[PDB]
Amino acid sequence: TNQLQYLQKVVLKDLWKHSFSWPFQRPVDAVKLQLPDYYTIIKNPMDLNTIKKRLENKYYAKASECIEDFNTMFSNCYLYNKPGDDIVLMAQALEKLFMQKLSQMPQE
Numbered sequence: 001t002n003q004l005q006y007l008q009k010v011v012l013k014d015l016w017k018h019s020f021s022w023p024f025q026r027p028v029d030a031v032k033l034q035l036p037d038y039y040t041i042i043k044n045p046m047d048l049n050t051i052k053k054r055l056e057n058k059y060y061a062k063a064s065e066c067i068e069d070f071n072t073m074f075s076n077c078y079l080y081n082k083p084g085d086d087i088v089l090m091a092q093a094l095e096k097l098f099m100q101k102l103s104q105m106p107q108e
């Protein structure tokens with residue numbers, strides 16, 4: 001849980017506080033957003049709120065599962081959209097800030 005503790009108390013908390021994380025704090029509502037074939041293209045939707053709940057509920061056994069959830073959220077966004085898009089620019093800056101806090105996680 002030590003790494004998992006750091007993911008929840010440091011990484012998630014820091015990522016959520018960035019103003020441009022707002023698109024990622026809730027699951028993508030493909031209908032209200034009028035997104036065609038979102039659910040056909042993205043078969044594992046993921047978002048920060050779900051990661052929060054999973055960490056609150058100790059859904060994760062190992063830190064690695066949680067890291068994969070962060071990455072899935074990013075890579076879903078990179079796959080469905082195009083380079084240069086606003087939403088991609090936001091994900092890219094969020095991931096850079098993710099990688100930085102993750103690089104200071106307790107070792108081992």
Ligand SMILES: COc1cc(C(=O)NC2CCN(C)CC2)ccc1Nc1ncc2c(n1)N(C1CCCC1)CC(F)(F)C(=O)N2C
Nearest residue numbers: 022023024027028029033035038076077078080081085087
């Ligand atoms: C909160 O509701 C929204 C409202 C508005 C909204 O109403 N914006 C207007 C209001 C203010 N003006 C100024 C600009 C338009 C825009 C987006 C919203 N939400 C959202 N959340 C997440 C995604 C997303 N959108 N996407 C965006 C990119 C292109 C249009 C959807 C693409 C995506 F594929 F779903 C994706 O990967 N993500 C992560």
